[PDB]
PDB file of N, CA and C in Angstrom:
ATOM      1  N   UNK A  29       0.838  -1.223   0.000  1.00  0.00           N
ATOM      2  CA  UNK A  29       0.000   0.000   0.000  1.00  0.00           C
ATOM      3  C   UNK A  29       0.853   1.246   0.000  1.00  0.00           C
ATOM      4  N   UNK A  30       0.462   2.236   0.788  1.00  0.00           N
ATOM      5  CA  UNK A  30       1.213   3.479   0.881  1.00  0.00           C
ATOM      6  C   UNK A  30       2.264   3.372   1.974  1.00  0.00           C
ATOM      7  N   UNK A  31       1.876   3.684   3.202  1.00  0.00           N
ATOM      8  CA  UNK A  31       2.786   3.604   4.338  1.00  0.00           C
ATOM      9  C   UNK A  31       2.949   2.176   4.827  1.00  0.00           C
ATOM     10  N   UNK A  32       3.219   1.285   3.898  1.00  0.00           N
ATOM     11  CA  UNK A  32       3.429  -0.113   4.214  1.00  0.00           C
ATOM     12  C   UNK A  32       4.833  -0.309   4.777  1.00  0.00           C
ATOM     13  N   UNK A  33       5.693   0.653   4.495  1.00  0.00           N
ATOM     14  CA  UNK A  33       7.062   0.624   4.961  1.00  0.00           C
ATOM     15  C   UNK A  33       7.247   1.600   6.125  1.00  0.00           C
ATOM     16  N   UNK A  34       7.816   1.125   7.244  1.00  0.00           N
ATOM     17  CA  UNK A  34       8.050   1.954   8.431  1.00  0.00           C
ATOM     18  C   UNK A  34       9.147   2.994   8.190  1.00  0.00           C
ATOM     19  N   UNK A  35       9.257   4.011   9.065  1.00  0.00           N
ATOM     20  CA  UNK A  35       8.417   4.188  10.236  1.00  0.00           C
ATOM     21  C   UNK A  35       7.305   5.221  10.034  1.00  0.00           C
ATOM     22  N   UNK A  36       6.229   4.818   9.379  1.00  0.00           N
ATOM     23  CA  UNK A  36       5.110   5.721   9.154  1.00  0.00           C
ATOM     24  C   UNK A  36       4.141   5.645  10.315  1.00  0.00           C
ATOM     25  N   UNK A  37       3.291   6.642  10.394  1.00  0.00           N
ATOM     26  CA  UNK A  37       2.294   6.732  11.450  1.00  0.00           C
ATOM     27  C   UNK A  37       1.143   5.772  11.195  1.00  0.00           C
ATOM     28  N   UNK A  38       0.852   5.539   9.922  1.00  0.00           N
ATOM     29  CA  UNK A  38      -0.232   4.641   9.549  1.00  0.00           C
ATOM     30  C   UNK A  38       0.288   3.511   8.678  1.00  0.00           C
ATOM     31  N   UNK A  39       0.900   2.526   9.315  1.00  0.00           N
ATOM     32  CA  UNK A  39       1.451   1.377   8.609  1.00  0.00           C
ATOM     33  C   UNK A  39       0.358   0.638   7.838  1.00  0.00           C
ATOM     34  N   UNK A  40      -0.861   0.685   8.363  1.00  0.00           N
ATOM     35  CA  UNK A  40      -1.994   0.037   7.720  1.00  0.00           C
ATOM     36  C   UNK A  40      -2.619   0.975   6.692  1.00  0.00           C
ATOM     37  N   UNK A  41      -1.790   1.443   5.784  1.00  0.00           N
ATOM     38  CA  UNK A  41      -2.230   2.353   4.738  1.00  0.00           C
ATOM     39  C   UNK A  41      -2.456   1.590   3.437  1.00  0.00           C
TER      40      UNK A  41
END
């Protein structure tokens, strides 16, 4: 997806 790669705030993007 989008923020599938850390360290994002919404990993479940």
